[PDB]
Design a binder for this molecule. Sequence first.
Ligand SMILES: [Cu+2]
Ligand SMILES: [Cu+2]
Lengths: 620, 620
Amino acid sequence: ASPFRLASAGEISEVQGILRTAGLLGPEKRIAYLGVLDPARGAGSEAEDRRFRVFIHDVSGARPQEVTVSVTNGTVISAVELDTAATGELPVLEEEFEVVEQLLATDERWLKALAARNLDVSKVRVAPLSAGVFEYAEERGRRILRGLAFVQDFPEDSAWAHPVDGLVAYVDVVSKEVTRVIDTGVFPVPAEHGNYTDPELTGPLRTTQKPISITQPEGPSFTVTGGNHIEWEKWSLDVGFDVREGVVLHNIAFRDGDRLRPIINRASIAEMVVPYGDPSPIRSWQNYFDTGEYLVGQYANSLELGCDCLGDITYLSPVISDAFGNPREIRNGICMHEEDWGILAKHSDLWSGINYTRRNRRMVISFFTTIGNYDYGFYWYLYLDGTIEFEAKATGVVFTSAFPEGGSDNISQLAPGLGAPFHQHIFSARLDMAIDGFTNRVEEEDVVRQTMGPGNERGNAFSRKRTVLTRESEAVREADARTGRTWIISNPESKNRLNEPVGYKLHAHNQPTLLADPGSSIARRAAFATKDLWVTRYADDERYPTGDFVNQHSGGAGLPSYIAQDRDIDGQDIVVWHTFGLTHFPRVEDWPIMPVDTVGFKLRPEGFFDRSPVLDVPAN
Amino acid sequence: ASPFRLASAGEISEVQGILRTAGLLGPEKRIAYLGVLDPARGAGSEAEDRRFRVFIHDVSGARPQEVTVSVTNGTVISAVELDTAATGELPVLEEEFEVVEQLLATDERWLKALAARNLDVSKVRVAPLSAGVFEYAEERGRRILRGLAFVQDFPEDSAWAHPVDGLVAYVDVVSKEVTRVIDTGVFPVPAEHGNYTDPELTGPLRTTQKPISITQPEGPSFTVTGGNHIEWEKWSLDVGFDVREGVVLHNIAFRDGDRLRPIINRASIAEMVVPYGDPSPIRSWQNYFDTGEYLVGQYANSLELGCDCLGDITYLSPVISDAFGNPREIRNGICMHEEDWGILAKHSDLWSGINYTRRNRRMVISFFTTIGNYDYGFYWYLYLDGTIEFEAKATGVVFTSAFPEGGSDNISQLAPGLGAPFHQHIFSARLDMAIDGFTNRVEEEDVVRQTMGPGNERGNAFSRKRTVLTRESEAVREADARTGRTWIISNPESKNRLNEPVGYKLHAHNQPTLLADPGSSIARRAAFATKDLWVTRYADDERYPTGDFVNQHSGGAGLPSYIAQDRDIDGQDIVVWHTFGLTHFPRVEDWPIMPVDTVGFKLRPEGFFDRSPVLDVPAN
Ligand SMILES: [Cu+2]
Ligand SMILES: [Cu+2]
């Protein structure tokens, strides 16, 4: 049906077959990533060729491959062997997660370290963490996973309460060997438990909360057709799902009277990094690209009604591939519903005697994922007035360490002897713009203060200025909250009735960007995170701000590389990449399980419509 | 009962009786302001003494008076005659608003101006606006209102669609004289109507919105006691209402275990200014202090159940004084309800096998006001996790002008020939802090980036720094979004279990502050709006950042004068004044009636609790 429909169990099985019949999917081969490719640029691309891209790992130690197959024509379009030392390692496999603990359990250096701390090896959990790229030359080409230890007193115990500081291991997950064990010294292992379900810690549960019932006696106002095509209050879009990016929104458009007007061609969180700011050798290499290295989509939770999504919910259960090419359904992995959003517009006019009030609503499309200790909710909102917004909610259990005797400038104390290293959660929203079509342009808008004098004798005047970003080399922008800086995406060939180019304005939260020293490895590998806004010319192979293979990749890939092309972006098919994140100095209130904190951004119509697009909402 | 109870109709009538008995309220007197005073700093004190402050205007031109009476004792505590040219005029009286159009209707300069535009005087509405302080020496000591004209084509017509540019008049509302009529030249009067209720403009209404039903089968979770004392999910507070400030929150405290811990003694929006940025002499004087000059509480709407406040709502109907001292109730002027607030905390742990999800909710206290073309909603939120937040929602109809033929740097076009002068809506939240009691201090916290090198070899480390504000002279602070600047209010004598002073962190939106030139009249009159945060030592007569009398009052009172005392604020009874606002460049989507835009701030606990305060929230 729609070329944007979600991948089917069958298409996944077919990809598996094709790889097999083609001799690419053997018993020692593993699927590290598989996902459908979006239709190519073609107004009315009639001939539908449903293609899938796969990253195939080899447990034997053979070079991995990137393959594109056509499920429609049962063929292999391309198969390329990869030089990981050059282009980066493949995403971490879920099955490689246990390997770190298993290997270490029989390692003399490891066991020695645990014995010095009087820790029973059978009680020691090891977090399989990405390694990044540091001074260890022997790691280039090898797929390494570093390990940090946490003690689990019993099966249902929260190990995060018991970090084992002063100890870290590096493991080659293919040759299956412990490349190194570093013990900088014994630190007391925090004793208090962090079991948020233990009545002893929670105390008597509240009996004060009365129920809040949210129902829709006539069902929801949105319609879902073709499995994932949404139609709601003038909005139209397709909800896709990718194992790496998670929920992806396609063809976001608004039916302005007679015309279905495009706004955004593709919206997604194309990367998400969590850099740690603790200079201890035990953790200074710590930077998790949850999206790039771990693939947040595969870890999406199966949501539960009433608990995760309240109200009249319509679920999508996306299908993904397992390590062998078998389709796997994420039951109730995506929630879709509309929720009341207070007052939309209101005016009580003395002169006319008319008292007017209208209520707002927002269509919500979300999923929640769990990556080790973190849990993140990704929410996309479409409002009645044309506003588009994204919100990330960060929860989970904070990553712990020992709290140094004498305090720390880079770690905060959560409990006796329990520390929580400073870090950030930085996202990159990739917005493939289509403001009334693909001919777009971006302008940076700053508030302009004016000096009192001739033409402004009362010194009350203030204005605004707009600078068009014409080439990619001038499209790497930073925030300026002081001057109310925003960025407007417009279509210079499409004017509203007042003869001004239609547009949408991006309002950022202006949170701090990547704090790491500019010459650091993380500054190089996640260069996108050092600036708030990037604008590039669209290209079918420029999908992530960090490149295709993030794991153990040297640096400079992605955005810094794309931008180097210096293409024309003034009235062209362009893409906006917005960096936004949370800078977390964990507080006592974040322990033992943290309350949700949030970050996001939104885009509001700016001369897109000819008047308010909500004059037709009834009183109700 | 509680000394924080809302004023009763009887109390207001009694204040009238007391003033009458004292010879302070004869027939020529009018009550420009009347409000109950908060109990003095003296826990409990020597029994109940309900005191009311009143500003008494005299329609015959006699000097007005500021009076304080003890309604309990039937006495006048103090009464002083005011020299308005020095200390400021009293707030505008509702009755004076109509006087402007009435007088101008028979003024020959006005009639000549209208005749020059072929406008029927019976169809010309005049917006009666505050005058401010400029170069008109004859205005000093006089109560002046300025008038801008708008044509109303028929009874139910929206006059805002038809501004009459190039014309402004100044009126003395006491002597009833038109002091000046300035006509700078004719401008076409925009012809399109802005009738958002006219099917010709709205088009057929949508039939697509299905109902969203929000109910509470067992009633709300909060209890209302003593008329205005609220108890909800560990929170405790008193909801007061003042005609100038509107909703005021008293004694915000959190019951942590067995102890009721104070957080904020008093929270209110102590001032709000709307400065215009169009240098045309027709509007360059335009600045309203809705709170200080007009008294926003006085114009609170009666909220309709179902459209203004959805769900299980508990209303308060505050009582205020009319111009003669008679009590007037604002029926259903305050809404109170609790709303579901998505996910509170969530974690699916691999190692323990425990999947945990908890739902969030917030207590909401709000009111909506209308002053001319603007409608503002004031919302206070209390969350389960201890977070406190305020949100202002700006809607209504934009203030219009003609759109200059050759375009404008200070006005945007909304419809053919219809302009919307640039302006800001800036608020001042006065937070009389009581973090675990009155001994508090404020620290400015900035993120601190670190250089790669010795002790930070990988260049990944990042920290934070806190600077205590010790004296008022160093407590006028500005935002710094780039460095994640926040302000923490702590109690240096109350430490959490980790031996750190308990605290709350203020997170600002970092929006632009006052844009006007520093040498302008408005920069001096609204000095508070030029900086993001001020901290003062508490004083019972330091209530508003702009002083007691804002109307036609120059600089000389308010925050800049208080700060000069340079009092000790390091571990003392202190007050935080936060400036936050919206910079509005009207867009076509804001016409004919604007969709709600918002701004606010929040405070989150920072080591206030010994662990998460929501561990006792049940699963459902
Ligand atoms: Cu965090
Ligand atoms: Cu405005």
